Paper text:
[name] [name] ([name], encoded by [name]), located predominantly in the parasite plasma membrane (PPM), is the primary nucleoside transporter mediating nucleoside uptake from erythrocytes. Crucially, [name], a member of equilibrative nucleoside transporters (ENT, SLC29) family, shares only 17% sequence identity with the human equilibrative nucleoside transporter ENT1 (hENT1) and is unsusceptible to hENT1 inhibitors, which provides an opportunity to design inhibitors targeting [name] specifically.
To decipher the inhibitory mechanism of [name], we engineered [name] with internal insertion of [name] between TM10 and TM11, termed PfENT1GFP. More importantly, [name] binds to PfENT1WT, PfENT1Y190A, and PfENT1GFP with the same Kd value range of ~40 nM. Furthermore, we determined the structure of PfENT1GFP in complex with [name] at 4.0 Å. The overall structure of PfENT1GFP presents a similar conformation as the structures of PfENT1APO and PfENT1inosine-bound. [name] interacts with [name] via polar contact between the carboxamide group of [name] and Gln135. Trp53, a conserved aromatic residue from ENTs, forms a CH-π interaction with the 2-oxo-1-azepanyl group of [name]. The benzene ring of [name] interacts with Phe139 via hydrophobic interaction.
Author numbering: 30 to 214, 228 to 370, 372 to 600, 612 to 652
Write the structure that this text describes.
Amino acid sequence: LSSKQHFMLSLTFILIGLSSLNVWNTALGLNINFKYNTFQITGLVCSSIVALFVEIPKIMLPFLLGGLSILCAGFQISHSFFTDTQFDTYCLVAFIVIGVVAGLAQTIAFNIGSTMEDNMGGYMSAGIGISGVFIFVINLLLDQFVSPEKHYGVNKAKLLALYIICELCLILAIVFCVCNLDLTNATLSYMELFKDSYKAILTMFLVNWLTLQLFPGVGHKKWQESHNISDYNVTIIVGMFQVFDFLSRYPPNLTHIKIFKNFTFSLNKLLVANSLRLLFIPWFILNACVDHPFFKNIVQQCVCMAMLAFTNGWFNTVPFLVFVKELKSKGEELFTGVVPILVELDGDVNGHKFSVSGEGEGDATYGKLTLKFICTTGKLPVPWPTLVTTLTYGVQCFSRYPDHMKQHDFFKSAMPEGYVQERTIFFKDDGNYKTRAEVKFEGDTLVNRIELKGIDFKEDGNILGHKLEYNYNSHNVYIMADKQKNGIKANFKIRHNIEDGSVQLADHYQQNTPIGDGPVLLPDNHYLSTQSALSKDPNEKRDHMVLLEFVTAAGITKKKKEIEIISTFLVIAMFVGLFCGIWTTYIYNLFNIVLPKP
Ligand SMILES: Cc1oc(-c2ccccc2)nc1C(=O)NCCN1CCCCCC1=O
C-alpha cells in the first residue's frame, strides 16, 4: 500500500468537506436574514436522521454535487433577473433544497469512511475548519476591492465572486473524487445501553442548545440594529468566530505533550462545570442594552465572540474521546503515561553496609523500564546484577499485559494503594539474600524502598569474588496467587554468566501483599518473560550502571456494535440539540432588547 494513493484519497476527502461547508460559510458571511438560516438548518437536520436510520444507495455523490452546483449557479442569475418579491420565494425554496441535499451528501460521505482501513472522520473534522478559515480569508481579501452599491440589502460583487469561487471548488472536488473511491460493491436489547451511559448525551445536547441559539441571531444582528455598526466591521466578527471554532478542536485531540495534560478530564466534572458557560447570556444583553461609552469598541465584541468560539469547539469534541475509556478496572489510568521511578536501597552483606540510589522512567503501555543506578557509599563489595533482582524485578507493576489478560493483574490496581514485596534469594554454593521492599506513590512519583540482608556468603565465592560477567539475559517469572494472605507468590531462577564459562543459579521466592485496604485482583498461574540489558554511561565517575528492561506477560491463551450504537446515539443527540437551538431565539423577541432609535 503506497502513500501516493493515501495522499490522493486524503485530498479527495478534504475537498469533499470543503465543498460541503462552503455553502454555509458563504451564506453566513453576508449578514443574510434570519429566516433563510432557520430554513437551511431545518432542512439539514430533517434529512440527516432519515438518511442515518435507513441504508441509502452509495451512488448519488456526483449527482448530489451537480445538483448543488446548479442550485448555487441559479442564485446569481435569479437575484438580478427576478424582482425581489418573487426572489424571496426562490431564496426560501433553494435554501430548503440545499439543506436537504447537503445533509444527505454529508451523511452518505461519512458512512463510506469506516469501511476502509484508515480512519476518515478526522479528515471531515479538518475539512470543515479549513472551509471556514478559507472563506473568511477570501472575504477579508475581497472586502478591500468591492464598491458597496447595496442593491437589495446585499452586496453585488461579493455574491458573484463568492459563488463562482464555490462553483470552481465544487467542480474541482467532483472531478477529483470520481477517479477514486469506487462505488461498485446473538442480539441484545437497546434500552439497557441507553440507560447504562447517559452522561454523554446530555452534555452533547446542552453544549449545542446554546451556541446555535446565540450566534446566528443575537450575535451581531441585534448589535448592528442597535448601534448601526459599519458594514466594514461585520465581516470581522464572523471571521473571529470561524477561525477560533476551527483552531479550538485540535488541542483536546493530543495529550502526550506536557503542556496539554489537563484538557480531557472526565464527564461528571464536565457536566457540573458546563454551567460556567451560562454566564454568557447576560453579557450579550448587557452590551446590547447599555449605551455607556466603554462598550462602544470593536475589541470587546471580538473578544466575546472569540471566547464563545473557543469554548464551543472544546466542549463539543471531548465526549467523543472519553466514553470509550470509561465504558468498562481501577488503577490502569495511572499507567497511561510515562511514570518516574525512584529507588532507594540500604543493604548489608556479611557485615558490609551500603546504600544505592536509582532513578528512571517506566512506560506500561510499551511495558519498558529505563533506570540509572548509582552507589552513594562508593564502590559495592558485591556485584550489582545480584541486586538487579532487588532493583527492577522488585517492581513488576510496569509490565505490559495483553488486553485479554490486562484485567487479570493486581499490580495495576495495587500501585495506587501501594504494596509490600518480600523476597528470599538462594545462591547455589554461596549465601542468601532476604529483601523487604515497599512500592507506593510519593507525590506523582512511584517510589520503592528496599532493605536487603545478605548472609553466609563465602569470601572466595562467585559473589564476593566479583566473578560475575557484565551481562544479563531473558528469564521467566512464575506467578500464582494465594487466597489466605490475599496476595501473590512467585518463583524464578536467574542464571548468571561467570567469567570462566560456568553458570551460577540463583533461586528467588517472592511474596507480594497489598498495603491498602481496597480489593485486589487475584490472578491464576501465569508467567512474565523479561529481558534485561546492562550498560555503562562513560560521562560519570561514580559507581553507576544503566538498566533497560523489556517485560511481557504470558501463560494463558465482539461487542463493538455497542460502541457503534453509542456513537450513533451521540450524533443523533447533537443533531436534535442543534435543531432545537434555533427557534428558542424567538423567545428573546418578547423583551424590548433593541435600543431606541436615537
Ligand atoms: C463531526 C460530524 O459527524 C457527522 C456524522 C456522524 C455520523 C453519521 C453521519 C454524520 N456530522 C458532523 C458535522 O458535520 N457537524 C457540523 C454540522 N453543522 C451543520 C453544518 C454547518 C454549521 C452547523 C454545524 O456545526
